Amino acid sequence: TIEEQAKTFLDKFNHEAEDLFYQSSLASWNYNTNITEENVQNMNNAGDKWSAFLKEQSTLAQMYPLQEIQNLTVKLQLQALQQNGSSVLSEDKSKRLNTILNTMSTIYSTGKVCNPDNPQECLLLEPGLNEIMANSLDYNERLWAWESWRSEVGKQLRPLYEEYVVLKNEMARANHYEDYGDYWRGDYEVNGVDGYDYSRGQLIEDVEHTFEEIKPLYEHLHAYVRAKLMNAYPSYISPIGCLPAHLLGDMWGRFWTNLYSLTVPFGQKPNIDVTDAMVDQAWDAQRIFKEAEKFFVSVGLPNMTQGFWENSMLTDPGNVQKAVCHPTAWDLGKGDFRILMCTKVTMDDFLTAHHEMGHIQYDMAYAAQPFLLRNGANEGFHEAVGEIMSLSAATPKHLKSIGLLSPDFQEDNETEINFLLKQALTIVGTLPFTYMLEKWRWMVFKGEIPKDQWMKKWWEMKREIVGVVEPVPHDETYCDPASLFHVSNDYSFIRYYTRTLYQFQFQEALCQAAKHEGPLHKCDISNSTEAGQKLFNMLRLGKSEPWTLALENVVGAKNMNVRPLLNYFEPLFTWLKDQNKNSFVGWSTDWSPYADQSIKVREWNDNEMYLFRSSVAYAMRQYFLKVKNQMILFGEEDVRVANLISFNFFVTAPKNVSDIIPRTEVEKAIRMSRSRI
Ligand SMILES: CC(C)C[C@H](N[C@@H](Cc1cncn1Cc1cc(F)cc(Cl)c1)C(=O)O)C(=O)O
Ligand SMILES: *[C@@H]1O[C@H](CO)[C@@H](O)[C@H](O)[C@H]1NC(C)=O
Ligand SMILES: *[C@@H]1O[C@H](CO)[C@@H](O)[C@H](O)[C@H]1NC(C)=O
Ligand SMILES: *[C@@H]1O[C@H](CO)[C@@H](O)[C@H](O)[C@H]1NC(C)=O
Ligand SMILES: [Cl-]
Ligand code: NA
Ligand SMILES: [Zn+2]
């Protein structure tokens, strides 16, 4: 019969696929832990094997009727195996795309910028630039790191990324999607299950609908933060303008988390940022992941495996190897679970341990499922599980209990405004960032944004949707999207939007099962086996049930709903509306840090623009050797042109960028050399 054959086919495929998957997984591990030419080669071979095997089983599965399946377990598996991806591309195309992927990945993880005053002092993104963007209060140095990274590293990514889009769109349009974007939204698709179906376009709509309901609380968080940042960087921020992109606590403003030291509502209270308490005790990466383990075990979940501790890399290896430091949770297969994290002793590395270990715990739970279904019910479910736990672990109640807040820490209504504020800087601050990033990639893949307008459109969407403005104008030799890990390392990003809605929904139903009474934000599901079982019973399903039904069985809703996330932040919202009565709320897209020094302008090609920039640079060189008696090697690069028969420009001193030249000064220089034409 058909079923009995297919049953044995999928049974054989699943076990054969596990062992080939373990092989490329493990080769990807060694590459990521030990970036090396050899390991790139062992990776590429192991992957080539995996891909060729899938192409074989893909065609060999296209035989078994795509329809006529008795056990729906034995149907969706087939449906995936019949989609012969990658192989749609020629062997020349496919090897090129894998080369582009390894090149982007390698550039991003090895990219370095150097101090202009000391060329032998160079800085990786992790930890050097990251540490500057987390901690420096210097506007200029934060500018240097932000622009260096996008001009030394992002520019290397621009041409590769253009090819990446061409190749990925071809593999997708041949796998029968509208483009790579649509291929990605396919992670959320449910078909053939009435009352639980979900279409790829539904994802766009639900995301845009919910994002409307989140704007007000974002706008007020944006207004409060702007005001505080006007205090921390006096005279640099317009009270109706967008926030400068280098002033947000990390390289991109993905999270506004590190702005807590500048935005804390009630600085006199005991610190709810427990970084210092970890440093003052003997907290290392071992202690951190041991504490995260305690939490999942108190909830009823298993400990980590022996292999996990044996094979993870929870610290920076050193100068003995180059490793992708991005926290990542790996399910290599065959009971092999491990985490890659260059863990530091901050509260942020501490909540991230819980998040990454959440991935592991989900991976563990659905190990007992067929290989083809060993996945999240969708990608947001997977990202939400670590965050559920992170919500409980960040509560001052929980922190007090693991000795990081004094035993005398008094919960009052000012500490909760502090806690809710910090939470908002992470959770709410990231939602516009995330939506706008993915909205951009979705549009690039659909073809709605031409290549000559990628950066133009990118910084228009930053200003408009995010309330963030670039501090330096960027032309189409940049690829600012790709300077973030997820974009240069080819990962979807809506998982971070959808996990944020999911996580409060799940937190709501878990706090009820944990016999919580009171507001959601005071809830810590620690020690609740009833909470753990409710969650586990869903985790152990993998992707065997559609996610709409998996959501229903845990929280009683078929779809994502933003009501729980807003209830969580209701106290803080009220307080923010009060704190902002004398602030502007919203932003104008027109102000930019550099427009108050710019100058407008009267067959024209880029080479004309090159002679122009070179002339202005030359003019400047004279005007400082003449009207000032100095020699300054102004380059064409130091002439920054924006808003391009018309354009606006300003001049910066070479090796400083922040050092804009007074608009009145450049004018005299232009006049002084106006004779030469
Ligand atoms: C393969 C990917 C999809 C993995 C992806 N990694 C997380 C990492 C993380 C978790 N909590 C916060 N972060 C951000 C962060 C970045 C960083 F460099 C250092 C630190 Cl301490 C934190 C993510 O990017 O969100 C995931 O697990 O989703
Ligand atoms: C890193 O990779 C190189 C090349 O494969 C290898 O010789 C070296 O021993 C590796 N180092 C570690 C620590 O694995
Ligand atoms: C906290 O409580 C006091 C009175 O106990 C009140 O005046 C204040 O508005 C409350 N909220 C704060 C301080 O955010
Ligand atoms: C760059 O310009 C700023 C302008 O405020 C100045 O304060 C800073 O010292 C300069 N940095 C240099 C020249 O390295
Ligand atoms: Cl470094
Ligand atoms: Na920033
Ligand atoms: Zn994650």
Author numbering: 20 to 621, 634 to 675, 679 to 711
Show sentences the authors wrote:
ACE2 is an enzyme involved in the renin-angiotensin-aldosterone-system (RAAS), as is the case also for the better-known angiotensin converting enzyme (ACE). ACE2 plays a counterregulatory role by cleaving angiotensin II to angiotensin 1–7 which interacts with the MAS receptor to induce vasodilatation and, hence, cardioprotective, anti-inflammatory effects. In March 2020, the World Health Organization announced the coronavirus disease 2019 (Covid-19) pandemic due to the worldwide increasing number of infections by the acute severe respiratory syndrome Coronavirus-2 (SARS-CoV-2) and the poorly understood risk factors for severe disease progression. It is known that SARS-CoV-2 interacts with the human angiotensin converting enzyme 2 (hACE2) and uses it as a cell entry receptor. The small-molecular-weight ACE2 inhibitor MLN-4760 was identified as a suitable lead structure as it was reported to bind to hACE2 with high affinity (IC50 = 0.44 nM) and to show cross reactivity to the mouse ACE2 (mACE2) but no binding to ACE.
The aim of this study was to develop a 18F-based radiotracer for PET imaging of ACE2. Computer generated models suggested that the replacement of the chlorinated benzene ring of MLN-4760 with a fluorophenyl (F-MLN-4760) or fluoropyridine (F-Aza-MLN-4760) entity would not substantially affect the binding mode to ACE2 of human and mouse origin. Co-crystallization of the hACE2/F-MLN-4760 protein complex was performed for confirmation. The X-ray diffraction analysis of the co-crystallized hACE2/F-MLN-4760 further corroborated the analogous binding mode of F-MLN-4760 and MLN-4760 characterized by direct interactions between a carboxylate group of these compounds and the zinc ion site in a closed conformation of the hACE2 peptidase domain. The X-ray diffraction analysis confirmed an equal configuration of the F-MLN-4760 as for the known (S,S)-MLN-4760, indicating that the (S,S)-diastereoisomer of the synthesized F-MLN-4760 was correctly identified. The co-crystallization of F-MLN-4760 with hACE2 confirmed the correct (S,S)-configuration of the stereocenters of F-MLN-4760 and its conserved binding mode to the enzyme. Moreover, the obtained data highlighted that the para-position of the benzene ring does not have direct interaction with hACE2 and, hence, the insertion of a nitrogen atom in this position would not affect the binding mode of the resulting pyridine-based compound, F-Aza-MLN-4760. This was further corroborated in preclinical in vitro displacement studies using [3H]MLN-4760, which showed that the affinity of F-MLN-4760 and F-Aza-MLN-4760 to HEK-ACE2 cells was in a similar range, albeit 3-fold and 7-fold lower than that of MLN-4760. Preclinical investigations confirmed the specific binding of both radiotracers to HEK-ACE2 cells in vitro and selective binding to ACE2-expressing xenografts in vivo, while almost no uptake was seen in ACE-expressing cells and xenografts.
